[PDB]
Amino acid sequence: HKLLVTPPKALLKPLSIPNRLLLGPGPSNLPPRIMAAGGLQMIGHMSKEMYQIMDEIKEGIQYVFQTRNPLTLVISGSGHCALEAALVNVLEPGDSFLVGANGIWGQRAADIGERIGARVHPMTKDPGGHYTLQEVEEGLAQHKPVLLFLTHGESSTGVLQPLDGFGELCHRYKCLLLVDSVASLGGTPLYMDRQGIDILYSGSQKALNAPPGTSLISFSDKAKKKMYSRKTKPFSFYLDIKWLANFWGCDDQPRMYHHTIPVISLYSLRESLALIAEQGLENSWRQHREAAAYLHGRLQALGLQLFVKDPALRLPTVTTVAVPAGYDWRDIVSYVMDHFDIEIMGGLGPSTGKVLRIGLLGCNATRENVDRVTEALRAALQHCP
Amino acid sequence: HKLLVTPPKALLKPLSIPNRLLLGPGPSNLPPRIMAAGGLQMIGHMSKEMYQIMDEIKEGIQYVFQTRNPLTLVISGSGHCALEAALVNVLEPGDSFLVGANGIWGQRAADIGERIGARVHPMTKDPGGHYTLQEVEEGLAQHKPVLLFLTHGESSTGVLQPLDGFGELCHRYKCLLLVDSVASLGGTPLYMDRQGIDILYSGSQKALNAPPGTSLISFSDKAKKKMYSRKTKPFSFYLDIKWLANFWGCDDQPRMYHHTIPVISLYSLRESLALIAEQGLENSWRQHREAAAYLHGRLQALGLQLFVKDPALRLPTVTTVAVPAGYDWRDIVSYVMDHFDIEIMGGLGPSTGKVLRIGLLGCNATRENVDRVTEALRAALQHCP
Numbered sequence: 001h002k003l004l005v006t007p008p009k010a011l012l013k014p015l016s017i018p019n020r021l022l023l024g025p026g027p028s029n030l031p032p033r034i035m036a037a038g039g040l041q042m043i044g045h046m047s048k049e050m051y052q053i054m055d056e057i058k059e060g061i062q063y064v065f066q067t068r069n070p071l072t073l074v075i076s077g078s079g080h081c082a083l084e085a086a087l088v089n090v091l092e093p094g095d096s097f098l099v100g101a102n103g104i105w106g107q108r109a110a111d112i113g114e115r116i117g118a119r120v121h122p123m124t125k126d127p128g129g130h131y132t133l134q135e136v137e138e139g140l141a142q143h144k145p146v147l148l149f150l151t152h153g154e155s156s157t158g159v160l161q162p163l164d165g166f167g168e169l170c171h172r173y174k175c176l177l178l179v180d181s182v183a184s185l186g187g188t189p190l191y192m193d194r195q196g197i198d199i200l201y202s203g204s205q206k207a208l209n210a211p212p213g214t215s216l217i218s219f220s221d222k223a224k225k226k227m228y229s230r231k232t233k234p235f236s237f238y239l240d241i242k243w244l245a246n247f248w249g250c251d252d253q254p255r256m257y258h259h260t261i262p263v264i265s266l267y268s269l270r271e272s273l274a275l276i277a278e279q280g281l282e283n284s285w286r287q288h289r290e291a292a293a294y295l296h297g298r299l300q301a302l303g304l305q306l307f308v309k310d311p312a313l314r315l316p317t318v319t320t321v322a323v324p325a326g327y328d329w330r331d332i333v334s335y336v337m338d339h340f341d342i343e344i345m346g347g348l349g350p351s352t353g354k355v356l357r358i359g360l361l362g363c364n365a366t367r368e369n370v371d372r373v374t375e376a377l378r379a380a381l382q383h384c385p
Numbered sequence: 386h387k388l389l390v391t392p393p394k395a396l397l398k399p400l401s402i403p404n405r406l407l408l409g410p411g412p413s414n415l416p417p418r419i420m421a422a423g424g425l426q427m428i429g430h431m432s433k434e435m436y437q438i439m440d441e442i443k444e445g446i447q448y449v450f451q452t453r454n455p456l457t458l459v460i461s462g463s464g465h466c467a468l469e470a471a472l473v474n475v476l477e478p479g480d481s482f483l484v485g486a487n488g489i490w491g492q493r494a495a496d497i498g499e500r501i502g503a504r505v506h507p508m509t510k511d512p513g514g515h516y517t518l519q520e521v522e523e524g525l526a527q528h529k530p531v532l533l534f535l536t537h538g539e540s541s542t543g544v545l546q547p548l549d550g551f552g553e554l555c556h557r558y559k560c561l562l563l564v565d566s567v568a569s570l571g572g573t574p575l576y577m578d579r580q581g582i583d584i585l586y587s588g589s590q591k592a593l594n595a596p597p598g599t600s601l602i603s604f605s606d607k608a609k610k611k612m613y614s615r616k617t618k619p620f621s622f623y624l625d626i627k628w629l630a631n632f633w634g635c636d637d638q639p640r641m642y643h644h645t646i647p648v649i650s651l652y653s654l655r656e657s658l659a660l661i662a663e664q665g666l667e668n669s670w671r672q673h674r675e676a677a678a679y680l681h682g683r684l685q686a687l688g689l690q691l692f693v694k695d696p697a698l699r700l701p702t703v704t705t706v707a708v709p710a711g712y713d714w715r716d717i718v719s720y721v722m723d724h725f726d727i728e729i730m731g732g733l734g735p736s737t738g739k740v741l742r743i744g745l746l747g748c749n750a751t752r753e754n755v756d757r758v759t760e761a762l763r764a765a766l767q768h769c770p
C-alpha cells in the first residue's frame with residue numbers, strides 16, 4: 001500500500017473553457033437546445049425509453065438522408081469511424097475498390113482500404129478537382145470494382161461533388177456507390193435513394209451542430225446483401241454491421257447487447273435532428289447557399305481569391321481561400337483567434353499550406369457570422385506583416 | 386425537388402427522459418458536476434485549450450491507473466473499443482493469444498482475436514471461475530503466447546480476479562499482460578506498473594460515473610515496442626496507436642489531426658477524473674468495499690444467495706445473485722423498475738438467466754442506495770408469483 005502517482009494538481013482546479021466562435025470546417029458551435037440535452041441525466045442503455053429515442057433518431061436520419069432503407073443507424077464514433085464501418089463490412093480482402101481521391105477524405109478511404117486488404121485503385125486529382133460521370137465509368141470499366149467511394153462535400157478543398165446519376169452508372173457495372181456527406185449533409189441538396197446511393201454516411205459535428213463523437217450511416221438493399229453474404233468476418237467487432245443492425249432494431253430479432261451506446265451523445269444527436277426537422281431540409285439548404293453567397297462576396301472585396309473558381313462547384317458549408325501572397329497564413333489564423341476569439345483553419349492534407357478554410361454550419365451559417373469573420377480577416381490583413 | 390421523407394412527427398415533440406436510479410452493472414448515474422460539464426459549449430478540437438484539457442486527462446488516467454507510462458490515452462469509443470484498440474495494435478495475424486474466458490469479456494476478446502486472425506487459445510472456465518498463477522503458467526508454457534488477456538472485474542459474473550504477480554509470470558515466457566478493468570477501476574485495488582501490467586484499459590461509464598462512449602488505455606514499454614515494430618499495418622485506421630499516440634501528445638512530433646475527438650465527452654471525462662482525484666483512490670476503494678459489504682448482508686437476509694461463494698473473489702462494484710427458485714427473474718427486474726424506478730439487470734453471456742446483477746459505482750456506491758435496492762427487491766419477492 002503505497003502510491004507511485006499522486007493526485008494531479010491540475011485536476012484540482014475547476015474546469016474552465018474560453019468562449020469561441022468556431023467558423024472553421026467543424027466542429028461547429030452548439031445551440032442552447034443541444035447543450036441542454038448534453039447536460040441531462042442517464043437512463044438505461046437498453047431501457048425501453050432509450051430504444052424509443054434511438055427509433056426517433058433513425059427516423060431523423062431517414063429524413064435528413066431522404067431514404068427509407070431499414071438498415072440505417074448511428075455509429076458510436078466520429079465521422080472516420082462511420083467510413084471505417086462502411087469499408088470494413090462491405091469489402092472482403094482482395095475486393096476491388098475505386099476511390100475518388102480529390103482530398104484528404106479519399107486518401108483516408110484508400111488508407112483504410114489498404115489496411116483491410118482491398119485492391120485499392122485511387123482516381124487521384126489535384127486539390128480542387130471533382131469527378132465526372134465518365135472518369136468514373138472509365139475507372140469502373142478498367143478495374144471492375146465492387147465499391148466506389150465519393151466525397152460529396154470535400155471539406156479539405158471546398159469542392160462540392162456533383163453526385164447525379166453516378167449511382168445509376170455504378171449499378172450498371174454492378175458496383176456499389178459509397179458517399180461521404182459528413183461536411184455536405186444539411187447545407188446542400190442530397191437524396192440517398194433518388195440518387196441511388198448504396199452507402200451514405202455523415203457526422204454529428206458539422207451542419208447538424210451536435211458535439212463530435214457520433215456519426216450517421218445508411219445502407220441500400222444491395223449493400224445489405226453484400227454485407228450479409230460475405231464469407232469472411234469483418235476485421236472489426238465494434239463496427240460489425242450484423243451486431244449493430246440488431247441492437248438498432250433493424251432486425252426481426254430482439255435487440256441483443258453489443259456495446260454500450262453513448263446515451264448522452266444520443267440525446268444531443270436526437271435534438272440536432274429535431275431542430276433540422278423543424279426548420280426543414282430545403283430551408284436549411286437555402287440558408288447555407290445564401291450565407292455562402294454572402295460570404296464569397298465579402299471575401300473577394302477584401303482582395304482575397306476563392307480557391308474554387310467555378311461557384312457551382314463551391315461547397316457552401318466549407319469555403320476555401322487561397323493564401324494571400326506575402327502573408328504568413330499562420331499569422332492570419334492566430335490573429336483572428338487572438339483578437340476576435342474566432343476559429344478559422346488552414347488546409348488539411350493536400351490543401352495544407354495552400355488555403356484558409358472558413359465554415360458555415362447549421363445555426364452558425366448566418367449573415368452576421370459572415371460579417372464577423374470578414375472584419376476579423378480584414379483586421380488580420382491590415383496588421384499582419 | 387420533391388421529398389420522399391417528411392419530418393418525423395416524433396422529433397417534433399420535446400425530448401423527455403424519465404428519472405431512474407441505475408443500480409445495474411453500468412452505466413451509472415451522473416453526479417451534478419459531470420452533468421454540468423456535459424452541458425457546456427464547444428471549443429476547437431485542436432485548440433491549445435483542448436490539448437491542455439487532454440493533458441490533464443492523461444495525468445488523471447496515470448493517477449487512476451497508477452502508472453507513469455507515457456503511452457496512455459483516451460480511446461474515442463466505448464469499453465469494447467478500447468479492447469479492440471489493444472488487440473488490433475498488439476496482435477499481428479498468426480500471433481498466439483491466450484484468453485482467460487471466464488465470462489462475456491474473455492469471449493469478446495476471443496471473438497476479436499479470431500477476427501483479426503490471431504491463433505486464439507481460450508482458457509475456458511464456468512461463470513464464477515477465476516484464474517490461478519499456475520493455469521496461466523500452464524497455458525503460457527503450452528501455447529507460448531505473445532499476449533495474455535485477463536478480466537480484472539468480471540462484471541458478467543461478479544468475480545474479482547487476483548492479478549498479483551501474473552505480469553511477472555508473463556514477463557518470463559516473454560508474454561504481454563492485457564487486463565480489462567472497465568468494471569473494476571476505482572472500486573477495488575489496482576496498480577498497473579507495480580503489478581507489471583502491459584496493457585490496461587477501462588471505461589468511462591462505470592465507477593467513474595461519466596457517460597458511456599469514451600474509454601481509457603495505457604501501454605507498457607514492452608507493449609509500445611511490439612506495436613511500433615510490427616511488420617504489418619493494423620486492420621484499423623480509427624484505432625491505430627501510432628496516430629492516436631501522436632495526437633495525444635505521446636510523441637516527439639507535433640500533434641497531427643487524426644480524427645475529431647469527442648470534445649464534450651472529454652469535458653465530462655476530465656471532471657470524472659477530477660472528482661476521484663479529490664476523493665482519492667484508496668478512499669474510493671474503501672467505499673466500494675464497505676458498500677459491497679453492507680449490500681451482501683442485506684441480500685442474504687432476504688433469503689437470497691450470492692452467486693460467488695468466496696467473498697474474497699466478489700467484485701465489489703458488481704454483485705451477482707442466484708435467481709431465487711420459483712421466481713421468474715424477468716418479473717423481479719420489471720417489478721423493481723415499475724414500482725421503484727430502479728434498474729437492476731439479469732445475466733450477460735454465460736451468466737444469462739443464471740443471475741441478477743446489482744451495481745455499486747462511484748458516487749452511487751452508497752449505503753443508502755443499498756437500502757433502496759434491498760427494499761425494492763424485497764417488495765418484488767413479496768408480490769411476484
Ligand SMILES: *Cc1c(COP(=O)(O)O)cnc(C)c1O
Binds near residue numbers: 156180212645646
Ligand atoms: C469532418 C469530416 C469527416 C469526419 O472526420 P471525423 O473527425 O472523424 O469526424 C469525414 N469526412 C469529411 C469530408 C469531413 O469533413
Ligand SMILES: *Cc1c(COP(=O)(O)O)cnc(C)c1O
Binds near residue numbers: 411464466568
Ligand atoms: C462495461 C464493460 C466493458 C465495456 O463495454 P462497453 O459497453 O463497450 O463499454 C468491457 N469490459 C467489461 C468487463 C465491462 O464491464
